[PDB]
Amino acid sequence: RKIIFLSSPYGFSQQQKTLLLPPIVRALEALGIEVWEPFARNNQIDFSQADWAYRVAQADLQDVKNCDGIFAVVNGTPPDEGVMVELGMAIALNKAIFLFRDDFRRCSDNERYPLNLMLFAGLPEIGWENYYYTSVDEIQSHDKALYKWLTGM
Amino acid sequence: KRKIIFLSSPYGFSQQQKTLLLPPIVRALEALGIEVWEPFARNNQIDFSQADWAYRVAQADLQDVKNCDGIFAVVNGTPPDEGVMVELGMAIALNKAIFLFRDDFRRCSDNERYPLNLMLFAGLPEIGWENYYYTSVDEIQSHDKALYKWLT
Amino acid sequence: RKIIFLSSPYGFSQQQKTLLLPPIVRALEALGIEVWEPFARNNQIDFSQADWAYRVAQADLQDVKNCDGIFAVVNGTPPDEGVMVELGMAIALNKAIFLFRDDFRRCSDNERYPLNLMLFAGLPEIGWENYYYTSVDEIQSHDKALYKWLTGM
Amino acid sequence: KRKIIFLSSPYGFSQQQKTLLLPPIVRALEALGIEVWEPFARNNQIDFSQADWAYRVAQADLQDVKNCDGIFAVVNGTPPDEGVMVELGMAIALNKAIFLFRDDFRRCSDNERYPLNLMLFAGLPEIGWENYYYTSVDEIQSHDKALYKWLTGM
Ligand SMILES: Nc1ncnc2c1ncn2[C@@H]1O[C@H](CO)C[C@H]1O
Ligand SMILES: Nc1ncnc2c1ncn2[C@@H]1O[C@H](CO)C[C@H]1O
Ligand SMILES: Nc1ncnc2c1ncn2[C@@H]1O[C@H](CO)C[C@H]1O
Ligand SMILES: Nc1ncnc2c1ncn2[C@@H]1O[C@H](CO)C[C@H]1O
């Protein structure tokens, strides 16, 4: 099975972590994907020791190296800095890239993209919108990049 | 052959910041004998009247991070700029040298170890990461900090 | 019946609108408060005409003038600029102030408060944290400011 | 007697920004004959060794906004700074004169009319709001913009 790293800032808010993440994980898993979600995958880190921050950093770094694609939740103004670092790692490692934003605000300096142009550096010049999801219900669309990627095209 | 530093900042988005904040930093770096690639300057030959300009700038910045020796990332703001963060993650994944700059005294973090989100330090060592972390322009040329030591 | 203006950024994201806001609305309503939620209250605006943005701004401004207190959701780094404007209006108009933040990141310019000191300018020097709620489940606590407000204590 | 501008900005948080970005804006406003109240400077005499300093600064800033004639809000960033936004909201509710400054060319808005969150413009008129919206330091001096009309009763 293809491995998706689900990069989001939803683990920082108790309510967001509980209500927002599980539905996205389920949509992904219904496509046959193995989902790596960093907040859940790090729940067994000894939050006691002071080095936990460095341990989590390295664990997330390895999960990106070892995933097949990244599903980056890029809601908010601006998108979360941890998601962006992990997205930049994904781009540089030639992983598949999928972006999610159901926030309807536009926040960018260019007409082409709704966000800072670097978020799109790992996507094609034409047809990048096919990798850009704007609702949870769209994740399972057979006409979007995630489905096509699983099934060849 | 000079070492090449990609100077990643959000300062080009503001007319005033572009004019007054970047030159002092570029000059401090050039003083060390570094070749500075500053993405806003490096893309001023682009035709910003064509809609494809955004993709061309993305690919330029992507290529310049690939081709640099290290990144000097201005990570001021709450949060740090998302373009800088993508470029920083690229630099980490490609084993470039990493240097961080924050002269913002606000602390904005999940953890007690680091003043920012822990991912920004994933490419720095567990011990002694502070030596790569600059908190004022006047500190950039310090011979006790990681950028000078890396050059030599 | 006391009127709370529930100020939040959650109407900008489809998922956050449907999943995060109703639970907070219900917790406030269970205390016996009349909740004014600006995204719901503006859904009968004619959004085809360009001036809709001005109409929403004035309707929001009036709701804050006419409420008794503000319940400001100040998750995020930084908190939402619209919420902050409205918080600022509430402070100047001597409305009662209640803050909600279940995001565990600390992001502040000072040792005393968990956020930018100006968010607390309308709270008392002593006991400001009694107005600062950290989980949805805490909203109904008999020991916090909303309840004291409703029982005159 | 000079009109009083409260110059609200996040530039005091960064050593370089405080040193290089604020004085040119202060000078621009003073060139119009305005008295400028810049909160990072006005609070330099607070005793920052006592933990209550944050409460004293908050109250001092709150009082300055009550006592000013208008606010000049530097609303650069994505998003604009939350302390600036609180003070802007105070100024709107207190019927102060409102002037916004953004030389950030990123557009970051919920709507097609305004370049930023619509609530920042709630204190400005429906028509001609852009006359109060400055996009460069050099434009502060413009006799066609709101600061100058304000000072000449036009
Ligand atoms: N405290 C934390 N726990 C787990 N992942 C974290 C984290 N802080 C940052 N990250 C990583 O960066 C992203 C959110 O900032 C997603 C996650 O992989
Ligand atoms: N319009 C632009 N011009 C140049 N670089 C840009 C840019 N938008 C984003 N970037 C890249 O991403 C970072 C700033 O967000 C630094 C820069 O290299
Ligand atoms: N459509 C809208 N645009 C901006 N702000 C809005 C809004 N509807 C409601 N608001 C109020 O303004 C703040 C959101 O930015 C909090 C919210 O209560
Ligand atoms: N010394 C200081 N430290 C932090 N915030 C300060 C400050 N002086 C003033 N403030 C207020 O903090 C707010 C941050 O934008 C606005 C500003 O008026």
Author numbering:
A (entry chain D), C (entry chain C): 3 to 155
B (entry chain A): 2 to 153
D (entry chain B): 2 to 155
From the reporting publication:
Guided by the structure of the enzyme from the thermophilic organism Chroococcidiopsis thermalis PCC 7203 (CtNDT) bound to the ribonucleoside analogue Immucillin-H, we designed mutants of CtNDT and the psychrotolerant Bacillus psychrosaccharolyticus (BpNDT) to improve catalytic efficiency with 3′-deoxynucleosides and ribonucleosides, while maintaining nucleobase promiscuity to generate over 100 distinct nucleoside products. CtNDT has a preference for purine-based 2′-deoxynucleosides, while BpNDT prefers pyrimidine-based 2′-deoxynucleosides. Importantly, wild type CtNDT can utilize ribonucleoside and 3′-deoxynucleoside substrates, albeit with lower efficiency, demonstrating less strict selection of 2′-deoxynucleosides, and a possible strategy to produce 3′-deoxynucleosides. , As proof of concept, we determined cordycepin (3′-deoxyadenosine), a natural product currently employed to treat various types of cancers, can be used as a substrate by CtNDT. We have previously shown that this tyrosine residue in CtNDT (Y7) does not directly interact with the 2′-OH group, and instead positions the catalytic E88 for reaction.
